[PDB]
Amino acid sequence: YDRGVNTFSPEGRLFQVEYAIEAIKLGSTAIGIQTSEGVCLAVEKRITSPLMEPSSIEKIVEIDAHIGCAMSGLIADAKTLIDKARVETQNHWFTYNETMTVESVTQAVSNLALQFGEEDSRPFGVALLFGGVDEKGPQLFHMDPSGTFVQCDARAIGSASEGAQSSLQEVYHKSMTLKEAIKSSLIILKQVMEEKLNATNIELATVQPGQNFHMFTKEELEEVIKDI
């Protein structure tokens, strides 16, 4: 019974949107961590063949100067949201002369998240992980495809999402530092990765007020690999 594609549910909610919420579960695994020294993050590139080029696949993007973002499930639709929100960050620098706050990325994205309609066009299955550091210090943010925003100290998406967060609930604490957040997360990452750990399997995404950007650089991740 396909009716209008916009029809509610008797429970209930939007049919097509909730179906895409379940579609997030097949995406890549990415775990952010909020730390006073900086907001780190990492993702698994999910190598589909030995021919894969490492720098061509990146699941983390940079919106503003200090503001990062991540992608889930379907890509190109989120990639459009990336640069389209960057236009709003530049328009933010137009009047306000300064960098957009990390919390205002919610109003810059989640407000326009689903505008879809039959007249005047289809929802999204991608959840975003918003990293950054605003004037109040490090902030880790996450939004769903439906536009609902929530602040999380650690958030996992894709396949390992439920499993990674359930395991990471114990290891996280208010005193977690940066280097500790990176090496304690890759323990979960090496558990949630199918392929043997190498430089092409996973990439690091970090943002710090005094060291940037950074992001992260390659051949240093291998130095952390031997520190496994």
């Binding site: 989640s110 407000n111 439906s146 609902t148 929530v150 602040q151 999380c152 100290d153 967060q165 609930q169």
Partner: peptide, 30 residues
């Protein structure tokens, strides 16, 4: 949702004399 996840605020300011609660889809709420 989870423990470390911050509780989403319901009451938000609108006008000087207007307070409001909220529920339903937050996208259509905003």
């Amino acid at each position: 949702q989870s423990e470390l996840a911050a509780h989403q605020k319901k009451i938000l300011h609108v006008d000087n004399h207007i307070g409001i609660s909220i529920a339903g889809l937050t996208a259509d709420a905003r």
